Amino acid sequence: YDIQAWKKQCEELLNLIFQCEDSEPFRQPVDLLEYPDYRDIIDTPMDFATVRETLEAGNYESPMELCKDVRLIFSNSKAYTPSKRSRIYSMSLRLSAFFEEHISSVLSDYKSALRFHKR
Ligand SMILES: C[C@@H](CO)Nc1ncc(Cl)cc1F
């Protein structure tokens, strides 16, 4: 029932994501010199360094907010991909599955802790 536990759990999950090779295209903002039309398709860029920095600055109030930004990294990759078979998009699907598998307990524990707080 620790209402604050999600933060370190998210830091550790981001550490695992950064250790994974599949995260390399998503660790920093998409390079507009490499993909000059990126902002014509993507309205809200997002990357794992921005998520980590937001978390470390104390600018997420809940793990749901962090989860919304991580999911935006994946939806941007899906919206920008020219093919559902593309390399970068394929890496995003594996990273997404790993992220969802691990964030589920973080979200559950946080929501359970908040319900206990308001019992
Ligand atoms: C924790 C690590 C242990 O080797 N396994 C993984 N880490 C990251 C991804 Cl995206 C997929 C994995 F299977």
UniProtKB/Swiss-Prot annotation:
Range covered out of full length: 1316 to 1434 of 1821
Residue ranges annotated for the Bromo domain, each copy included: 1-106
Location in or out of the cell: Nucleus
Noted disease: Chung-Jansen syndrome: An autosomal dominant disorder characterized by developmental delay, intellectual disability, autistic features, anxiety, hypotonia, obesity, and dysmorphic features.
Organism of origin: Homo sapiens
Phosphothreonine sites (modified residues): 44
Tissue-by-tissue expression: Expressed in myeloma and epidermoid carcinoma cell lines.
Modification type Phosphoserine: residues: 90
Complexes and interactors: Interacts with IRS1 and IRS2. Interacts (via bromo domain) with acetylated lysine residues on histone H1.4, histone H3 and H4 (in vitro).
Role this protein plays: Probable regulator of the insulin and insulin-like growth factor signaling pathways. Stimulates cell proliferation through regulation of cyclin transcription and has an anti-apoptotic activity through AKT1 phosphorylation and activation. Plays a role in the regulation of cell morphology and cytoskeletal organization.
Protein name as it appears in the record: PH-interacting protein
